Symmetry: C3
Subunit: 423 residues, 3 copies
């Protein structure tokens, strides 16, 4: 004999603060008078202003060098809780979670709700992201994955502690693709000019944020706000570093430090403008003018040679190529597929979210942890292609080595006491 | 030390009643002398009688306007239990369950066992379903999803109550694609005539129904038929309505009423003949003669503008387009990619089949619930295309608004007592 | 208040024995001084030695008849435990597990890490597996699925019994595709000759085996090696037979016997060289010279007509075609799409790995079990194609009927006692 009551679950639009534009700080004030919060969603519309298709028009920019806009607009998304930075997001973490957790039908639908694919569409995160024609009326949706947006039993209640000031920050990007850019560096300097309609009539972006509010019956509402609840969360930790400039020799050895136990380590080398490009550009059709394809696949063409993780000043894995650390590593656990760009990961634990860590890199006693990245030299032009031994001018553009990790924490919920227990 | 015994699980062919033809009532008598029942499969062979490929032959009909046959033959499948209509199916529910529960590799294989794709095949429920050549010898399989065909622990036993008269009904359709139709309305009136071999040599359909029989060892057979078992089921509820005719203005406000708590609401606007067509037809090659592609994708081309669900005479969600209610809504709970036709869905609950409803629309106390559908006006010919603002003559063909919902019920099993508990 | 300790999980490279070459026995000695072992991985590099693309060059062999190398190199992988053959693998089981358990993103990534796909790539196990150009520098990875490589709670501990001698055997194959073969039988007899660079500069294969070692804290290490533990495993059982030669009539009735309860039966008819080819070859472009496509899809073109499983000298399922036993059967339990080659499967149980068999073919009391395979006659040349009624010379090449089954066993762990309990 089950017990059922009149339950509800509305989706009221949360308040916004600040004018959403290009390159500005946008704060979102999620409500706190409800029982428990769930997953959030973001809405950003970025229409193009092109005209012709993928045909070559000399030095004019058409629909051939287009990338995802909403995926590049985000830069940092920190979830502040009780005036304490619990977890923070970046541009590399938004693409790393798709190639790890999203294994079922979530990855297929992610390519259509992020990348503007109309003319010659392709359900892929990269390699062919051409837009529409003139003024495409559409909307883009990008959710924010959290540690309580996966199950109803692991949700964070807001009625038990209505005094905490929670707030998320969304940092937008001023540089937009297919609007003020067309090449790898600068395209004839087009800030707002309309050279044969290819950079004019630029419009701003609109941010429509909404957060659902949980509604529990009054029978279980009094018992929830008064009883001690020991919850388990999975926060994120990032540490942006710097990689050596591509030249004759490429070898780094920057140390990596964190806090408690870390499940796994993952990072991705990205560019400053076309961060979703793996292989080097080529001045041979059809690669760059006309650009029917952004870049060729095959991880062997990527300038990144190999890598090696350091642990306790001892070896951790055999010196394998990029085809094993980027493909086979996410294929073991969770069974997900990546993309030809420059991802790196290492399979470790097999249970994410439990009451006992069964194999986790406890960094509380470790005092030696670094990472190395081997790249390919240049000594070649950017009109012949790339590879594992030669790279054109599309290599010095990427120089940001941001490593994002995931740790496990326990939030102590107590009326009148706020402490930090064990990991 | 586990306990094992000699277990069996055969699949005996059940009996049939009635001659399977075109447009007739076909009853299936599932056995009841066994211990329990699982899933049932249906077999219907619908061979074509065409000759040429997708080449244009003037007014003659070839292989260019073909749709799925077994998916259109099913019209109503009601599962009668104890002379009480527990749940009923329709033509819209067979396509809505594919874009919801089928998230893994179930949707990819569903396109091959339903849609006849031979010449220029495409693993998709629509957009390119061309058949073979002359007399294709093949068979089609379409099972019936029930509330006890998902796990062995939630199966409905038949040995505990061998007095209930269970029977399922299969209503076939007389109108078959690529046999008596070729255009949107009537194609030169071809009832049985063979105009250059394009509608002759029509054959009937054969129905091969078989239901597996559960076999439980005698150690647990006596304890099952005698002990009270409180099982939880997930029935279905449908309510066919009527939408306004496409004209200058398109706005409806038909109320929707049900019974107990409903998990989520979903419906789909379908045509009378080519119900698997979303975008409007165009008289420009290659759309209609020759028809290499049935219709263009992009949800913006669909005549349906937007919708809004009513709850407690208050707003429920922001007025979003069709790209958000058809793509992002099924992307949350159970990420399953849909299709470009005209499906609507709203994410709500996150646990289907539990002992406690954690967020369900309890309709037992609600007295106000409606739905609205906004379409696009005409004022344009059917030879230029469709869109969100103009539609040709392919809009008045669809006028059936059948909404299918899912509710939760508890079947009280008692020897000598048959009552209805709570939801 | 959870309990956490400093845990580790290294991946030390295990020792190797024997020189890895073409057609030799390679033994792998996994360590046993650790706490528990997990999943293992294999590394085999098989570079091609071609030059031109898929262009026709007369009788010369180019890149048009290429198949997977690492999938064909393995032949028998037996996991010996305590000098007892617990389970054994074959070439058919490595492809059957992909079309069964691998339902999510595991099958998509399996096609890229097995089949050499560079020029005109295709994420599919067959139908288009062309290599690169000259000397492709790449590595292939193929793990070994076991009964303890699916979850951390069901892992086999090695610290509780450090006296058992565990060892796995890897039998390599001397016949390699795109090296000493180009046609169906013999291609102008090319053992090592380099006819216009198409079979010269042959290199050996390197085997890099590594097995991770489990590390548990000392608090739970003493309690694990001393207390009894009743674990449940899922072993494999194979039985290679022989099918009748393709002629005027094709009908077999070889009995099948095993041990305890079997979950399900599955087999696949494979060739001796191009075992990943289902449809018959055709001398019409583009099938064989130039070979842009290996074979056409559609299960109706396969020479295998139908089959029927025998159980207790009684019928078990209706005489359905190959489109029902190869597609609809894997579509039910664990929705995994197969491939067009000749795979057979029958859905039975729904729970794999539990404490109570809820429906298993207990062969302990059965004394009658056989299988039949119906094929198509010849009486046609190999230059017109295949089908369900006619087959060319590509039918007598396949004559190995190896049936692989899966059973359930219970390993009794006791210090000083080694017995066999029930199934």
């Amino acid at each position: 004999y089950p017990v059922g009551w009149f339950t509800k679950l509305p989706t009221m639009a949360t308040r916004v603060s600040g004018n959403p534009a290009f390159g500005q700080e946008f704060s979102v004030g999620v409500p706190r008078s409800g029982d428990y919060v769930l997953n959030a969603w973001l809405t950003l519309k970025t229409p193009e202003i092109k005209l012709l298709e993928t045909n070559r028009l000399g030095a004019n920019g058409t629909v051939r060098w287009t990338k995802n806009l909403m995926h590049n607009a985000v830069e940092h998304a920190s979830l502040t809780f009780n005036d304490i930075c619990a977890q923070q997001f970046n541009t590399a973490y938004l693409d790393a979670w798709t190639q790890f957790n999203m294994c079922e039908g979530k990855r297929i639908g992610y390519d259509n709700m992020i990348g503007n694919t109309s003319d010659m569409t392709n359900p892929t995160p990269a390699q062919g992201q051409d837009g529409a024609r003139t003024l495409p009326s559409k909307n883009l949706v990008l959710p924010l994955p959290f540690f309580f947006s996966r199950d109803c039993g692991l949700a964070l209640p807001t009625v038990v502690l209505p005094y905490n000031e929670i707030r998320i920050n969304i940092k937008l990007r001023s540089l937009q693709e297919l609007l003020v850019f067309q090449n790898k560096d600068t395209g004839n300097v087009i800030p707002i000019s309309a050279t044969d309609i290819a950079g004019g009539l630029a419009d701003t972006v609109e941010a429509y944020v909404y957060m659902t509010v949980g509604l529990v019956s009054n029978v279980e509402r009094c018992a929830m706000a008064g009883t001690v609840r020991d919850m388990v969360v999975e926060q994120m930790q990032a540490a942006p570093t710097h990689i050596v400039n591509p030249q004759n020799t490429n070898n780094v050895h920057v140390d990596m430090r964190f806090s408690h136990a870390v499940k796994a380590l993952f990072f991705m080398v990205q560019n400053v403008t076309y961060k979703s490009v793996g292989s080097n550009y080529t001045c041979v059709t059809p690669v760059n003018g006309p650009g029917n394809t952004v870049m060729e696949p095959a991880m062997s063409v990527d300038p990144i040679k190999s890598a090696s993780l350091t642990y306790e000043n001892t070896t951790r894995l055999a010196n394998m190529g990029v085809e094993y650390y980027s493909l086979v590593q996410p294929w073991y656990f969770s069974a997900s597929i990546p993309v030809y760009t420059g991802y790196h990961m290492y399979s470790y634990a097999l249970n994410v979210g439990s009451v006992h860590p069964s194999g986790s890199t406890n960094y509380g006693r470790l005092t030696n942890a670094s990472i190395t990245v081997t790249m390919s030299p240049e000594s070649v032009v950017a009109a012949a292609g790339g590879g594992n031994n030669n790279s054109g001018y599309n290599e010095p553009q990427r120089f940001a080595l941001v490593v994002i990790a995931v740790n496990h924490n326990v939030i102590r919920i107590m009326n009148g006491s706020m402490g930090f227990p064990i990991l």
